[PDB]
Amino acid sequence: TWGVSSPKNVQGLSGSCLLIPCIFSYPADVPVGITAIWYYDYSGKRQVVIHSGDPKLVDKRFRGRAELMGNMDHKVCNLLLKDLKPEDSGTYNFRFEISSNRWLDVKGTTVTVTT
Numbered sequence: 001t002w003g004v005s006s007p008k009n010v011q012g013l014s015g016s017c018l019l020i021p022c023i024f025s026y027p028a029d030v031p032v033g034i035t036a037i038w039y040y041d042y043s044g045k046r047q048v049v050i051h052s053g054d055p056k057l058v059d060k061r062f063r064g065r066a067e068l069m070g071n072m073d074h075k076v077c078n079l080l081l082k083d084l085k086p087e088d089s090g091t092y093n094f095r096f097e098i099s100s101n102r103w104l105d106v107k108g109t110t111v112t113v114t115t
């Protein structure tokens with residue numbers, strides 16, 4: 001079945017890093033490269049944190065501070081956020097595109113960054 005599995009909320013500290021564990025799934029009948037995209041505040045600012053298809057789409061606010069630590073071939077979508085700022089608090093949502101066969105996790109993971 002289609003889905004993304006990750007903690008609902010995670011806490012982080014200013015200046016530190018945060019690794020959001022992530023595993024995704026899709027039906028075995030779907031023909032398969034997979035594009036990985038992580039959004040920040042999808043329903044609002046909708047800024048691109050990670051984009052494996054075209055890194056040029058990444059918002060300047062995240063360039064050099066975020067990296068996809070997962071192996072898409074192994075269905076791992078781990079997100080590493082570096083040099084955390086209080087402004088990084090908010091919800092991050094993963095989206096993967098295969099080919100109609102695309103999926104956006106509406107749940108996402110909410111990050112809280114304190115001093």
Ligand SMILES: CC(=O)N[C@H]1[C@H]([C@H](O)[C@H](O)CO)O[C@@](O[C@H]2[C@@H](O)[C@@H](CO)O[C@@H](O[C@H]3[C@H](O)[C@@H](O)[C@H](O)O[C@@H]3CO)[C@@H]2O)(C(=O)O)C[C@@H]1O
Pocket residue numbers: 002100101102103104105106
């Ligand atoms: C396998 C599959 O069916 N993939 C669909 C996906 C998934 O259903 C979805 O990602 C699961 O979360 O939906 C696709 O279309 C959706 C996409 O365009 C999003 C963009 O935000 O909107 C969805 O419609 C929403 C709409 O935006 C809301 O305003 C409304 O209240 O609810 C609608 C849903 O009922 C689209 O369904 C996708 O690309 O993600 C199409 C894939 O084929």
